[PDB]
Amino acid sequence: KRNQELAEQLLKELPHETTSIANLVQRNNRDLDYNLEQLVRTLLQMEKEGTHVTESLINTLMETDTLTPKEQALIWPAYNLVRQMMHHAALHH
Amino acid sequence: KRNQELAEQLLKELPHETTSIANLVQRNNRDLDYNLEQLVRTLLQMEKEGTHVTESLINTLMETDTLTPKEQALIWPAYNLVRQMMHHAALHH
Amino acid sequence: TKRNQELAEQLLKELPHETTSIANLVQRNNRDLDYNLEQLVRTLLQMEKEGTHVTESLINTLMETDTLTPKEQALIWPAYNLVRQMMHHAALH
Amino acid sequence: TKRNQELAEQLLKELPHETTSIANLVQRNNRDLDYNLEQLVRTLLQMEKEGTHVTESLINTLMETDTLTPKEQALIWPAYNLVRQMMHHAAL
Amino acid sequence: TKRNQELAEQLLKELPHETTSIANLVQRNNRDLDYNLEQLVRTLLQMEKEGTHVTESLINTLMETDTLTPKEQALIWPAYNLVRQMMHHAALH
Amino acid sequence: TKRNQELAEQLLKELPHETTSIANLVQRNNRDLDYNLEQLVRTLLQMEKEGTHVTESLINTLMETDTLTPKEQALIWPAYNLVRQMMHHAAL
């Protein structure tokens, strides 16, 4: 009933093509980068409030089921980056 | 050890602020819009290949555990939109 | 006269940018889904506020015995997932 | 827990502004009318460009035949009026 | 002379846009995580290709008895999740 | 299942281009050197603007005191050379 040609025509008119594997990786990188920046901000909010961010704090946050699986996947990279940022801010010039 | 002031300063230097509730909704809308467009494309790929997209096809795709939970959440809105698009493409002028 | 044709040709260049018909059908469908999702999210948070904890089993019971409309049932899981994210986000911060 | 209730109460204040259901039905209908009007205006100007002069009689003939969809027939006169305004506005 | 100062002031306006130090630390950390994640994803797909099906229990066993490096263990779950998405995406399409 | 293996084999061909580990260590080190060089160049020009003329003797004094980090000391001469080129290039 011309249904196949209609579909073929709609597919050309659709804004974005079907996502490549390369585009799935890029999209997943952006999502990890977004979630990592929120975790970094959460950990620095704790540091600002007077809860010092240490390996032991991260271990206790992990033991306590506080964090989503996506957060638990990124909590160590967030920890590493927070430490780098705290050390960078410490040095003069 | 000036750790709180360091954290307070880093938080001002961070590109994006902590995400509002409004921004969580906007971000969730963009993710639903992205996943809906991919589902619409998958269903139209089926229509192009000669698998007619009907309420019964969607029921069978749902019975068979083929789709992720996020896909199952959007398969009916994708179905509705595919039907609208197929009907819009059918009419002359 | 060909004056009329040139006037029309000039007006066609000056017309505001127009989304294609299919692209506008998608955008319009996204806005409608986003609006209906935000109402459901509000309804579920109203339940939580009043002391009815929003859980997978509450959603199952509301769906059994037809307490939700078919339009609600279409979006109830995305609404549920977003409410859970929001309750977790509020618990931090 | 009382914590869950207060969290929900706080989230309800933080939720983006929501148009009431009736107000949103109007707004949505305005957007759709504006979109369909601008398509019809473009279609009528495409005809003018191709050498079909856009007149009251052309609109009557398009209506008397089922050449237009119901949605188009609803907006064809406002599209006609606007096309005439635009043709008059052009090259004053 | 104040010639030297004005020359410097002019050069400072002409210098390419510079990301702030903290923003560059984030960007650099994202690139490193993205690179290491893509290597792990490749390693896991190589296993799948060779006939070792990539499952939650395989990841658990590789993590127990220290078969993965600490740097691998840091990203193994995000790699796992992405491999699962990619295998599901390839099954459609 | 043989299906899983072929899917993986196909995904491996579709994966974005990956620099080898050694090549990526070089590229990453180049980006970091380029970034830290441009910061030092900016710092030296900020000094020139403020009235501290940038000379070989100033760089020697900055080095002889532990005023610079190890990363800065590694790049201070290339930053100096580039600042001198830029000051000479400006107002030829």
Swiss-Prot record, chains D, F:
Domain of life: Viruses
Descriptive protein name: Protein C
Species of origin: Tupaia paramyxovirus (TPMV)
Gene, per the UniProt record: P/V/C
